[PDB]
Write a protein that binds this ligand. Structure first.
Ligand SMILES: C=C(c1ccc2c(c1)CC(C)(C)c1c(N)ncnc1-2)C1CCNCC1
Length: 338
């Protein structure tokens, strides 16, 4: 049984051969990753004389079409004249090779999850968190450009890469869409899933900001803020920290009744967790006790006043109301950055 004249396995993936030379241009070094879309190889480009990351899309129509959307979005972002652009991974070019769409990107380093592992899941300092936070708010401002309006739809530590410097770039626009395009109900990775998506509600660019808030707390503590085992557990861990969501949201939510019940007086409550709003971010961060674990007492940039400013920024990111949740332009104005 032969797939694609022998070039593919039985899973529509190109069979990666170490040292293969494509088109008298690319020298394939190695496989550096597998995903649903296909694979990523490290390769040397002879024309440009540099190492690149080549995303090899599966030879299967469902995956080709998804990647054509991904290419269209990266090419749109590329056409834009800003320095904000460079917080997104740069698509250099694309080609077909043996019936596979290949995307050529700049070679980046490891992701923010890898970083956290290398902290033994104790987190990075508030200062590094702040630099990560600023770049990420800047990236989200760029995506919020009226002509782009890209919702990422899957922000998480493993989709933010180090270049090598604490320079970082967003990757994986493979779940992404533009505002005004229709609804998909099961989106975002579970720990980073906005309450509107949990509630089956219409969403916009604010879902990215919600993920961002979850991310930043994680980068500093070492662990996920809301580590849900499923959707019910997820909404419940949100409610522990942030309380019961506004009545105007729940009165309207196609999936309100999955997590909440309307009590006889018309108020909402959950259907054993800490009571709504009782696991305070204030404590998770250790605002007054020398940061998380107490591991940052007296370190510069880690005063009680610094932590309060950080706590304030996150809670604006974790606002239940997507209309009022902090937006990228103003997140950059916040005193955490000043
Ligand atoms: C196959 C994956 C993957 C591996 C490496 C990279 C990417 C994705 C993204 C890009 C292509 C941007 C890139 C880059 N530019 N430089 C270096 N490595 C990468 C995985 C990661 C974990 N989740 C499943 C998919």
């Amino acid at each position: 049984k032969v797939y694609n004249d022998g070039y593919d396995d039985d899973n529509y993936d190109y069979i990666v051969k170490n040292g293969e030379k494509w088109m008298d241009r690319y020298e394939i070094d190695s496989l550096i990753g597998k995903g649903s879309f296909g694979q990523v190889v490290k390769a040397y480009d002879r024309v440009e004389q540099e190492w690149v990351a080549i995303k090899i899309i599966k030879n299967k129509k469902a995956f080709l079409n998804q990647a054509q959307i991904e290419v269209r979005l990266l090419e749109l972002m590329n056409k834009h004249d800003t320095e904000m652009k460079y917080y997104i991974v740069h698509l250099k070019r694309h080609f077909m090779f043996r019936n596979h769409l290949c995307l050529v990107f700049e070679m980046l380093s490891y992701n923010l999850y890898d970083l956290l592992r290398n902290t033994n899941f104790r987190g990075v300092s508030l200062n590094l968190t702040r630099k990560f936070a600023q770049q990420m708010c800047t990236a989200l401002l760029f995506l919020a450009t009226p002509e782009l309006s890209i919702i990422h739809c899957d922000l998480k530590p493993e989709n933010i890469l180090l270049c090598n410097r604490s320079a970082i770039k967003i990757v994986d626009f493979g779940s992404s869409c533009q505002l005004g395009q229709r609804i998909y109900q099961y989106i975002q990775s579970r720990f980073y899933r906005s309450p509107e998506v949990l509630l089956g509600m219409p969403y916009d660019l604010a879902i990215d900001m919600w993920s961002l808030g979850c991310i930043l707390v994680e980068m500093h503590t070492g662990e996920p803020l809301f580590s849900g085992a499923n959707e019910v557990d997820q909404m419940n861990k949100i409610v522990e920290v942030l309380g019961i969501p506004p009545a105007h949201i729940l009165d309207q939510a196609p999936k309100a009744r999955k997590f909440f019940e309307k009590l006889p007086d018309g108020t909402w409550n959950l259907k054993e967790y800490k009571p709504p709003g009782t696991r305070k971010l204030h404590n998770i961060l250790g605002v007054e006790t020398g940061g998380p674990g107490g591991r940052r007492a007296g370190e510069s940039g880690h005063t009680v006043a610094d932590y309060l400013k950080f706590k304030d920024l996150i809670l604006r990111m974790l606002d239940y109301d997507p209309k009022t949740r902090i937006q990228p332009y103003y997140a950059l104005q916040h005193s955490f950055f000043k």
